[PDB]
A paper describes a structure:
Our scaffolding system uses a DARPin (Designed Ankyrin Repeat Protein) as an adaptor component that is genetically fused by a continuous alpha helical connection to a central core comprised of a designed symmetric protein cage with cubic symmetry (12 orientations in symmetry T). With these ideas put together, our scaffold presents multiple symmetrically disposed copies of an adaptor protein whose sequence can be mutated to bind diverse cargo proteins for imaging.
After mutating the modular scaffold in order to bind green fluorescent protein (GFP), cryo-EM analysis is able to reveal structural details of the cargo protein. Our current study employed the superfolder variant (sfGFP)22 with a V206A mutation. Finally, to convert the scaffold to a form that would bind GFP—and thus illustrating the modularity of the system—we exchanged the amino acid sequences in the binding loops on the original DARP14 scaffold with a sequence known as 3G12419,20. After expanding the particles by T symmetry and subtracting away the density corresponding to 11 of the 12 DARPin adaptors and their bound GFP molecules, the remaining density was classified again in 3D without alignment. Three classes had good density for the DARPin and the bound GFP components, with slight differences in orientation for the distinct classes. We performed two sequential masked refinements on particles from class 1, followed by a multi-body refinement. The multibody refinement searched the DARPin and GFP orientation locally while being constrained by its position relative to the symmetric core. The local resolution for the DARPin has a median value of 3.55 Å (with a 1st to 3rd quartile range of 3.3–4.05 Å). The local resolution for the bound GFP has a median value of 3.8 Å (with a 1st to 3rd quartile range of 3.55–5.55 Å). The alpha helical segment passing through the center of the β-barrel exhibits a local resolution of 3.5 Å, with side chain and fluorophore features clearly visible in the sharpened density map.
Residue numbers in the entry:
A (entry chain T), D (entry chain S): 23 to 165
B (entry chain A): 2 to 64, 68 to 232
C (entry chain O), F (entry chain N), G (entry chain X): 2 to 119
E (entry chain R): 23 to 319
């Protein structure tokens, strides 16, 4: 009921909506990844909505993102600053990334007030680093 | 035949005038379209050189009689269309009563799909505070008859008529018109029996136009020949 | 108190430019705020001017009163409303439509303002 | 000119933009509904922008949404948590819904400061319950 | 590291993402404009991220936007409040505009705290005035194609353009509606599908005409019947004052005079010249249209 | 909105002094802040002037825009950058070296500002 | 730094109007605040003017120094006191009594001030 708890749920509900808008433009493999990221954002909304009285995500899940980041970070050959939206499909995943950075700043205020959702904010920080790699893999698969 | 067929639908019109009245030079450009089958036309003219030194109504007759409705029983008397697409030269002397005179020379012809009226006008001997240079004419127009006769020696036609311009103080400014038309091309044209054109003009303004301008609607029908 | 009155060139005044300034100084001194000899006013006639983007011919008048600060908003509002009624009654007309008169009141800063009498 | 009045107009102008982006993916019937919702959001922006000196929406309009919610709430057979964005069209209306909850939280700060726009915030609360039903009707019409 | 600096970079990074999503729906010209606006938002993020220790955009850039705003502001003829998202393409640029107003409010807090990024916030304020003009140019470009398709007389291409949200009341410089050109050229199904969407029946052009006027003087009976079934003014007057009955008696089509007469045509009317339609029928010499018009009077 | 443009005497302009004001009023009205008829501008040509202590001959241009207050710093910064680009493109040159163009934007106070239309 | 010097028409100066400006620019540049080439000054001679309501004939001199803000009150007070001593020594006399010299120092705003060099 506090102001920081209601803003934090409002943005995590706005994040999981763009991911549902953006998973219809990707292929079949990344669509299985983006469906398992929406389930995890629905768990985080319970941990934060109840002020911790419900279990949030386990640490087995933050170890699941880091398996993926190390798998795509090899495919992506890093380069200089490249403007977002190379293709239409990779432009949808660059909108989802910048929402996950705004959700990270809201969940990170709940942590510095109520001491809860520290392992949730570590999930949104690894998430927004994954959505940056999924956006640059699509551009290369088109190249 | 090949002439009249150019006018069976709606035809784009371009009008261009270069003028000099008492040493005051000006230019007008007009654009619109014509429906000769019905003899209804619409044009919007803009003064491209600022404010006109003469009233818009004095330029109406100068600013495309090929758009006249010639009813079927008078088709043999349509000189204007028969000269197309090469066109005709139209020359006029316009004498304003108790005032100056306009002399005009225009070429009316197709340029691509567009009927073009390109005019040179020279006016002299106008009075500084007369109805014309003093801008005392009402922004309206009356209906007139244009009386046409064949000029066989010149393979063309002549016309005479008198324009009546309403003056803001209720008086009437007469403008006597003499006209002659000669084909631009060397091909044969129709030379008509005596007849006349009945003309109506409606002047208006475009509420969104900031430049000195004239919006014009005109209908033209040929008559003066008894029907059977 | 400095009074700068800027009128366009086509603006016709009921009076001469010099008599407009005598009426505007009596209207400032009648407010009891200013000394008698400290009211200094000047009149400027513009040559190149434009109002708006329309081709309509117009005229305008403008006065900027500069007074030292330290006065509340009730005194400053009464000095703008006292002059605007003096100027608007001296304007006969000009251009093709209504004349616009306006008066700004701005505060000089009292600490950094230096004054001497030769 | 106050900080709460300018934020409240900034989000209601961002809400009525997504509805214009999302009314090209729906059918002809729901398009007539979504066009009358944009006119009503343009009225609310006048009530809040002028701090009440202009009339906002009447109560005849809040009684208009509630006619619709009771009409669709019969078609939609409620179920367990279903992830947003079943189809592409119903994914566009789930982004518009989560903006209307963010506009509700801004208009509701204007209310708890300036005492204005109470019957406006009751329009944005009924709106975001309608956009949730319009999103679940489209999925069923596809099913 | 301060709270106002991190929020300001978070929104400028969210702004330049929507512009990348929205530059795939525009044409090739505006795509060259929207690519040079993304480079400039990437400069502003450096000025604000480093708290000024890096050079931001020059003033040469805020003078570049203002060249564009003055070029499109002539094409766009302003009108009353029109709802965002006329077309799909112009709906994408109205989402980008409302993000640029939210970025302006964040960059403007950094300015009122740290005194930096004043010429950046003047770039985002000129930007959001440009994205409003680019959004209203696209709808117009869509609306001129409806006029061209109505003059071409295309059955399916008019419905294709109408299904994408083009305006039914898009006017030209001479003031013509697509209903005017559709009734003039003589395509009955185009008038039907334009009237089904809600085109205004009694629109006036710069000559004061009405779709019934051109439909009467053009000799198409079906468009007269359809327009009179849908609520056209039977006694509309042009700049001279001719009714549909006036031009109908002028053009010599008897059956359209019957169709005008069935729905209550005024015979007792006059124009500015003073002539009734019976007078214009007598002036041409057609006996039948003089006989039918006089008997019903 | 009052626009006072002060140019030195040796400064050569691309255009006439009157045409510089039409271009400067269209650049202010295109910002959507101001009414059409409320934009008032004036041009002044200086006679006795000095820039710096050096013996180099120089020219300069200056514009002071006065707008009623109540506007944020993003609007005022865009009005200075919009005019400075209009003035700098009307300057052909003058003196022995570069011309300096500058535009100030100052806020009148809204409460004490009186306005009437005769 | 802009220096606007406004003298009435009847005020007699020790020097020419052009030499008064060279002395006033050396007094501003000697304060070390301003660049050498950034000191711009101009002299204006009034025609229609009135001081006070009395019939006494008077003359006055006024200077308004506009400097960008961000300077403390000790620097602004020293710029008013440095110029007022330059102007008061150039006044020979005028009118029927003492001449009044005054110097205002006002701050332009630094963010909205645009400057370019053609």
């Amino acid at each position: 009921k506090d102001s920081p708890i209601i803003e934090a749920n409002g943005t995590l509900d706005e994040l999981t909506s763009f991911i549902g808008e953006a998973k219809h433009y990707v292929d079949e493999e990344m669509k299985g990844i983006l469906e398992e990221i929406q389930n995890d954002i629905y768990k985080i909304m319970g941990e934060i909505g109840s002020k911790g009285k419900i279990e949030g995500i386990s640490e087995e899940r933050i170890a699941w993102l880091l398996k993926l980041i190390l798998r795509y970070m090899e495919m992506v050959n890093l380069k200089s600053f490249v403007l977002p939206g190379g293709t239409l499909e990779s432009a949808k995943l660059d909108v989802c990334r910048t929402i996950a950075r705004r959700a990270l700043r809201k969940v990170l205020t709940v942590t510095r007030e109520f001491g809860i959702g520290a392992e949730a904010a570590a999930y949104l920080l690894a998430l927004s680093d994954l959505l940056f790699l999924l956006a640059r893999v699509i551009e290369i698969e088109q190249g | 035949s090949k002439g009249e067929e150019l006018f069976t639908g709606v035809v784009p019109i371009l009008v261009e005038l270069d003028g000099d009245v008492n040493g005051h030079k000006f230019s007008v450009r007009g654009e619109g379209e014509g429906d000769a089958t019905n003899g209804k036309l619409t044009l919007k003219f803009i003064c491209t050189t600022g404010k006109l030194p003469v009233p818009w109504p004095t330029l109406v007759t100068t600013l495309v009689q090929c758009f006249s409705r010639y009813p079927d029983h008078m088709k043999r008397h349509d000189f204007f269309k028969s000269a197309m697409p090469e066109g005709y030269v139209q020359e006029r002397t316009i004498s304003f009563k108790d005032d100056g005179t306009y002399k005009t020379r225009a070429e009316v012809k197709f340029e691509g799909d567009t009927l073009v009226n390109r005019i040179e006008l020279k006016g002299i001997d106008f009075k500084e505070d007369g109805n014309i240079l003093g801008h005392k004419l009402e922004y309206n127009f009356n209906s007139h008859n244009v009386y046409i006769t064949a000029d066989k020696q010149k393979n063309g036609i002549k016309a005479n008529f008198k324009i009546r311009h309403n003056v803001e103080d209720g008086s009437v400014q007469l403008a006597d018109h003499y006209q002659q038309n000669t084909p631009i091309g060397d091909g044969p044209v129709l030379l008509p029996d005596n007849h006349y054109l009945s003309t109506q003009s409606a002047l208006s303004k475009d509420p969104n136009e900031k430049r000195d301008h004239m919006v014009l609607l005109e209908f033209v029908t040929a008559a003066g020949i008894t029907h059977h | 108190p400095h009074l700068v009155i800027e009128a366009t060139a086509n603006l016709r005044l009921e009076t001469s430019p010099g008599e407009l300034l005598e009426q505007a100084n009596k209207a400032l001194f009648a407010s009891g705020q200013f000394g008698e000899a400290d009211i200094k006013s000047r009149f400027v006639t513009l040559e190149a001017y434009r109002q708006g983007t329309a081709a309509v011919e117009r005229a305008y008048l403008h006065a900027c009163l500069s007074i030292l600060d330290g006065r509340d908003i009730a005194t400053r509002t009464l000095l703008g409303a006292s002059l605007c009624a003096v100027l608007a009654e001296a304007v006969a007309g000009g251009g093709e439509e209504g004349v616009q008169v306006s008066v700004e009141v701005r505060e000089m800063e009292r600490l950094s303002y230096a004054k001497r009498v030769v």
